[PDB]
Amino acid sequence: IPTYDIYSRLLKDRIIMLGSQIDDNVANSIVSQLLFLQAQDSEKDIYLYINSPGGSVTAGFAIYDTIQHIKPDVQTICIGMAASMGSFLLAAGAKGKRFALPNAEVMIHQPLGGAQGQATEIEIAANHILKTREKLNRILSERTGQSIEKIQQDTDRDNFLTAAEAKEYGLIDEVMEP
Amino acid sequence: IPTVIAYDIYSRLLKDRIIMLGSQIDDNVANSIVSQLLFLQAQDSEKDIYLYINSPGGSVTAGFAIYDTIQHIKPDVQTICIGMAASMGSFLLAAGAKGKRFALPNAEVMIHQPLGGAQGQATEIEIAANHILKTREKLNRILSERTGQSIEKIQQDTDRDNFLTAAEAKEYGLIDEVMEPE
Amino acid sequence: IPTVYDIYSRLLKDRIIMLGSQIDDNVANSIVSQLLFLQAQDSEKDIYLYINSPGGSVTAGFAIYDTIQHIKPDVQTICIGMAASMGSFLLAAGAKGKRFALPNAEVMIHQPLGGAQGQATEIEIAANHILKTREKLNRILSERTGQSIEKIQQDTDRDNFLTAAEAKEYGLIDEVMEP
Amino acid sequence: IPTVYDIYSRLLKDRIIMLGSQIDDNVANSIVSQLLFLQAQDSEKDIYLYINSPGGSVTAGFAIYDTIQHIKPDVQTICIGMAASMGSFLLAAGAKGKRFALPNAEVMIHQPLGGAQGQATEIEIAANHILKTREKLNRILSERTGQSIEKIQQDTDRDNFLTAAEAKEYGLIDEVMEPE
Amino acid sequence: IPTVYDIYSRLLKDRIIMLGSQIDDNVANSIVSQLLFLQAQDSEKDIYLYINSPGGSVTAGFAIYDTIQHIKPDVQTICIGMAASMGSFLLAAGAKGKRFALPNAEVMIHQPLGGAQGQATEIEIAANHILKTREKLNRILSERTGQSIEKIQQDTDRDNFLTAAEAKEYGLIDEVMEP
Amino acid sequence: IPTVAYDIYSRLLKDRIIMLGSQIDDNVANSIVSQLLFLQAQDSEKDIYLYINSPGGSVTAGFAIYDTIQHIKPDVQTICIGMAASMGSFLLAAGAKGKRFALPNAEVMIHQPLGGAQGQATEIEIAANHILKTREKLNRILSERTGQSIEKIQQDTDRDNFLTAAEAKEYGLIDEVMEP
Amino acid sequence: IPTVIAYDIYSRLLKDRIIMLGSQIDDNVANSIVSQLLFLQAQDSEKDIYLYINSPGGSVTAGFAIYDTIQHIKPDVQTICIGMAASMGSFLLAAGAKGKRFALPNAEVMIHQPLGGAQGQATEIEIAANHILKTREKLNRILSERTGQSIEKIQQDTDRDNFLTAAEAKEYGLIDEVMEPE
Amino acid sequence: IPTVIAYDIYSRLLKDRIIMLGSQIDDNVANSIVSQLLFLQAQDSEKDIYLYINSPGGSVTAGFAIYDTIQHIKPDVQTICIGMAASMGSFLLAAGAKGKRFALPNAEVMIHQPLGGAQGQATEIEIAANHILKTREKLNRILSERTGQSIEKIQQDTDRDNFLTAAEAKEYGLIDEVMEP
Amino acid sequence: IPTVYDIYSRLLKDRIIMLGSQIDDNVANSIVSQLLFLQAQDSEKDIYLYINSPGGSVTAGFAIYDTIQHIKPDVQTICIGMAASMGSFLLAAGAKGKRFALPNAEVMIHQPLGGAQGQATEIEIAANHILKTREKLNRILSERTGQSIEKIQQDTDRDNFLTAAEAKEYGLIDEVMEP
């Protein structure tokens, strides 16, 4: 905001700041930043700070798949709160390089959505959101080491975790101490 | 709206065992129709009742309050479609006493599958989808019994809005006769 | 609005029905109930249906139309002011020889209007339905006026305003009621 | 709103109809029904139509106009307050010799108003219709006032306010009713 | 709202009319109908018109004004609360000698208000009409109060509030009604 | 709306029939409670028939009805038509034992209470404790009325749970499916 | 949108012949994408262009502005689905250079039939219905050519919303490869 | 929105004599397109101009500001339909230099009669009706000149919305060539 | 909007001013500022004012009109699209011999529009003002076209649409610019 703006100045040092809800506009910007940083240097780590209430699942997967596709390691650092698709992206950082600050919060839960129309249309929408949850649970299981059954049970309702609990859960690797 | 020497016009027709269904079907309408049906049975459990239907449809459970009351009471309930019987309106038309389901010649009948909505967590959406799918299975089973068509044919024919003339509704089994002028 | 009965209830006692609004399911339900009541009171005496209406729902209009044709009494139709769209269709539906308009009353005919929203498949279903509805209206209007279906189709493509004398020449009414 | 009957129903018992609002289909249907009822009660006795109206729908006004001319009784018209637009047309439609205005009542005449939207072909249809409607109104008003159609056309091009005395000079009424 | 008849209908039985609202065409239609009804019942007995009104439409007020002057009975006018604008004009229109205000009633006089929109020619027509309406009001108020038209014009250029005693001095009423 | 002078519902009340056919709020409960009290005063022994087609509503309003049913001397039969959901299914289960019915295609739905809380953490805690105690109260009564364990009721009301009339009988929410 | 040593991030990617289509498709978006394609061809008529697609779809005519420009220009336009390619977005994904249409492993693809509206006289509704049906036939024919699926199968599979994984989109022929991590 | 170095993408294309119409046509759009056409004639009075058209149409008088400017200036203005050219958009497509009017293969063209509104006194509605009818006659006369169809055929073919494929638009005379790859 | 100058800034370098909107105070102050700037750059060279405008505020238009007459350079006016109301007034205000319209440009002339609300005295003031404003516009338009004031008054009573050829015949422009 102070004028580079401050975010452009941090991007020069390979730091991307996610500090909002995740929608297609945010995801397209984050993806473009990741591809640019890879083009600048395919070896150096990238740092993705996350303070986000979540957002669109498909927008989040644009970021997730780009993180996994590019050559650089992407460190993830939770400040404030990583909720919903934000906590999914926090867990998507390079293994060994996923962090939270000591008073940061992590929240996990199941996807939300809506369906309107004919019974046949509602069935299609329900099957899609159920398949999307299975996809999220399968990946979270791979990234945390927890069973798919445990992820399913633990996301049935809003589940708030301290930074220490998120490390225990396998969502992060370390609580970043001063 | 007008008054007869004092009854409003619908109260006057109710004295002759005629019930007019001429609106969307919601709980308020169903409560009134059920009450009229129970009242008419208490007055005379043998005489026929006449239910005129001009309705775009409405709530499935409100329609089933009327449907079940029709089947519970002793009097035959004749159904007469004027104008249009759509959605739950055509379901109630088909629910009239066998042999006593009618449509006037230019009345229209429309059948289709139920509509609804669901919002919230994936598990809540799944519960709502399962509920509306089961409701459709229930409606199709009854319509099959009342029309003679197979459940599979009902399912195919209600996937989208399906408009029938009075003559087509008779051929389908939704009514027994097209009422020709007296 | 005034009391004597309200004024419309007082006229109903003399077998007069006033259709003086847009035609919707509520209006059709009331008119059909009045027609059925009058037939039950006396199945031989004429009924008088005054029409001042901009039109309205086609299915609501057909509830009235089919009830007129079903009951035993002749239903005279009398246009005052304007009978447009489904209003002019009901005007033409009165007992043959007993369809009237006052000298400065206006009659308007046109094709049905509607809407469709959604998938291409759903728009196609809605279009086929409104087109079949137009064919149904045109066939009946042809029968009631003596005009060919082809002429009715041409003459309803756009709004077509008729004077009372032109409505008689067209076959929508039988007589212009003079003082 | 007072009860005696409400006050209007009580006056209707004495063959008086009160027009005190804009003229739309609901008002016209009521007035036509009152006129038909009064003729059925007695086809010989006069009816009195009081008019305080800003005007309204032309077709609704013609429902009233044609019913006045159709029925057997003379319909006296009495302007109180203001008879504007379709209201002044109905004032002039009273039985000749029995059209009145009170001394400070106002009369306004002007041409019809309307709207049109859509394709050029549709706008043309709507324009032709309102122009034919104006010709019809002007022709009848010429017959009822004795003024030429050309003068009626000129005098209604814009809002034209008349005193009661001016309305009598114009032929819209027959007499200014002075205090009894 | 209470019932005895509702309270106002009960007062009308004793020839009392209550004007307690803004004056519009609906109110004038009711007041005029009550005046005609009372004259038809008895053309000699006085009528009592209570006035608590902020004013309203000039033509609606003149419907009432001309009916008061037309009918045979004397119409006493009694201001309670406030008689403003067309309300004070109607107060002054009561039978001479029978116009009253209660001691703390307020009277306000001012010039007409209106609006005009459109072409210059239309604005000119509207301005001429409201100016001619103001001249008519001033001429009648001059006759009713005994004040010159020139004085009425000056005293109504802006809102002019009067006590009951001042209204009597002005000629708008004849007496302040004491207990 | 029709008249028999009685409206149709007043006419049914003469035969000890009460129709609950809307959402349950304080106004509806006030009306139902008053009808129950009136019927007891007319005849303290004869059965009352309460038809239920309701999506539910306020818990405290529902308990005004519930406690009145249990307080009065007459048995209250409950008859579900259409749908008895949420507090509606609670009241259906509250009818006199042996006299709780559903029509064959009527639906029953049970779930836990819903609410909201806003303000300071202390205020949110008070509101949360209140809705949890309210849920425990509902579940304890439903367990007594159905014969199901409290643990099963809690399990079966965690989310919306739709039951057919035959399933509602098997569950213990009603005693019989009313056949034609 | 951050700035780079001065470019905004998207202008910086355009320097390397990368176009980001990351919103609903309307005339404004199509004007921008078409102008970028024309500019890139003018810079170099031989080098590939990369079109990233994360779009819920949008206007069919706006999508065809982009589609026809992709086919008209000389460079191959690679298409890469990230996140979701739905409706006209999945149609443009399938429009990339054959062999150079990609989706990331967790990207979603959705296909369905066109949506629209019609209001007015019966003859106007008929004109609008005929137009949207002809538009659907055009989309299906091109999608058949681009995927290898029959027109009949496309019609069947787009009757309702049809969600596909990246792997299923490859089997369907909408893309050529699922891009696995580098 | 993207920048080329500094030009926005549309300014960079204008440097190569390309004008992009990609919106409804209102006075603001017409002011901009007229200004670009004047500027390009000032930069070079001989070289062709390329006007891409993807437009639902819009104001007739705004469209005529563009139309008259195309005919007035010395350079040939090529018109290229991408997406859709409807209503005044198809009128402008047909207004390009003869032999240099193009549509891409899946571009749509739609022709129809003008739309408008009128409110007020009968005399004002008559003035408004006469104006829109004269405007329709003007549009039909010019479209006849530019397509080679008779005025009577243009009138009949524009009574309702009339959608054409690119190939149908060429046969009609609205364009000269379907641009193939 | 096209930018490196925007396109309008580039045309201003060549002494071209583009009027392409309604005329309000913001537009007038921009146009006046451009005219004054151009005069300061070169007081001898012509200025070109393109006009496509539905009109607007009379006083804003007179800010432009008086500036055109005040500065030394000839201001050519060129109508493209439509010059209506104050737009056609400004079109007629260009240097004599240098007022143009393109062949399919339209010109519309009519009387001023406005509004007035409040006391009768206030409506009278507003009516007198718009009437004097119309007299001022007609007198200037008479001078710039050669038509009598009486003819201008008659021809602007309602909306009067003119082709470019008719506007030349009327005297609002000097030439229809052919290709």
Ligand SMILES: *[B]([O])([O])[C]([C][C]([C])[C])[N]C(=O)[C]([C]C1=[C][C]=[C][C]=[C]1)[N]C(=O)C1=[C]N=[C][C]=N1
């Ligand atoms: B969360 O709350 O951020 C969650 C992500 C996940 C890891 C549990 N996101 C969602 O549940 C979103 C909510 C949303 C709906 C609509 C617009 C934007 C965001 N859901 C989806 O993206 C969704 C919904 N239905 C089907 C598929 N995806």
Ligand SMILES: *[B]([O])([O])[C]([C][C]([C])[C])[N]C(=O)[C]([C]C1=[C][C]=[C][C]=[C]1)[N]C(=O)C1=[C]N=[C][C]=N1
């Ligand atoms: B119809 O359109 O009348 C139809 C009845 C038919 C298929 C026999 N009714 C419905 O589909 C209604 C629509 C509706 C929704 C919400 C409020 C009122 C009406 N559906 C339901 O009643 C419904 C929806 N979801 C689940 C169960 N029931």
Ligand SMILES: *[B]([O])([O])[C]([C][C]([C])[C])[N]C(=O)[C]([C]C1=[C][C]=[C][C]=[C]1)[N]C(=O)C1=[C]N=[C][C]=N1
């Ligand atoms: B008219 O204008 O009254 C006309 C009747 C005439 C052609 C004999 N009615 C309609 O066109 C109505 C308009 C309408 C739309 C929506 C609500 C109410 C009225 N159309 C229909 O009733 C209709 C019927 N079937 C299909 C589509 N529209």
Ligand SMILES: *[B]([O])([O])[C]([C][C]([C])[C])[N]C(=O)[C]([C]C1=[C][C]=[C][C]=[C]1)[N]C(=O)C1=[C]N=[C][C]=N1
């Ligand atoms: B007046 O102002 O009441 C006037 C009557 C006068 C000329 C004898 N009436 C109208 O101009 C009405 C206005 C109106 C429009 C819409 C709803 C209600 C009233 N005009 C018409 O009735 C009309 C308009 N266009 C065509 C035909 N009739």
Ligand SMILES: *[B]([O])([O])[C]([C][C]([C])[C])[N]C(=O)[C]([C]C1=[C][C]=[C][C]=[C]1)[N]C(=O)C1=[C]N=[C][C]=N1
């Ligand atoms: B007053 O404020 O009541 C006043 C009356 C008079 C005795 C000075 N009335 C008006 O000025 C009204 C205001 C108004 C009320 C309701 C509708 C419209 C206007 N003015 C008019 O009645 C009127 C009369 N002729 C022209 C314009 N306005």
Ligand SMILES: *[B]([O])([O])[C]([C][C]([C])[C])[N]C(=O)[C]([C]C1=[C][C]=[C][C]=[C]1)[N]C(=O)C1=[C]N=[C][C]=N1
């Ligand atoms: B149900 O949905 O009818 C249910 C009743 C129960 C037996 C499962 N009712 C509620 O959950 C209501 C919802 C409501 C909220 C606000 C106003 C009206 C109704 N809840 C309560 O009444 C409630 C909520 N919080 C605390 C106490 N009571």
Ligand SMILES: *[B]([O])([O])[C]([C][C]([C])[C])[N]C(=O)[C]([C]C1=[C][C]=[C][C]=[C]1)[N]C(=O)C1=[C]N=[C][C]=N1
């Ligand atoms: B999709 O949902 O994006 C779809 C494209 C197709 C490949 C399945 N687009 C549409 O269905 C659009 C929806 C829309 C409507 C209105 C404005 C913008 C977008 N339809 C159309 O573009 C359309 C509608 N009717 C006729 C022709 N084209």
Ligand SMILES: *[B]([O])([O])[C]([C][C]([C])[C])[N]C(=O)[C]([C]C1=[C][C]=[C][C]=[C]1)[N]C(=O)C1=[C]N=[C][C]=N1
């Ligand atoms: B079209 O749909 O773009 C069409 C152009 C023509 C070639 C058939 N445009 C119009 O019909 C416009 C529509 C419009 C109305 C109002 C504001 C903006 C656009 N009509 C006019 O420009 C018009 C309307 N009435 C009179 C004169 N011109």
Ligand SMILES: *[B]([O])([O])[C]([C][C]([C])[C])[N]C(=O)[C]([C]C1=[C][C]=[C][C]=[C]1)[N]C(=O)C1=[C]N=[C][C]=N1
């Ligand atoms: B026209 O429509 O541009 C016209 C000018 C013509 C007669 C040469 N202008 C006006 O009539 C404007 C309309 C307007 C009203 C309100 C805001 C903006 C524009 N009228 C006036 O500027 C005006 C001037 N004096 C008094 C009242 N109105």
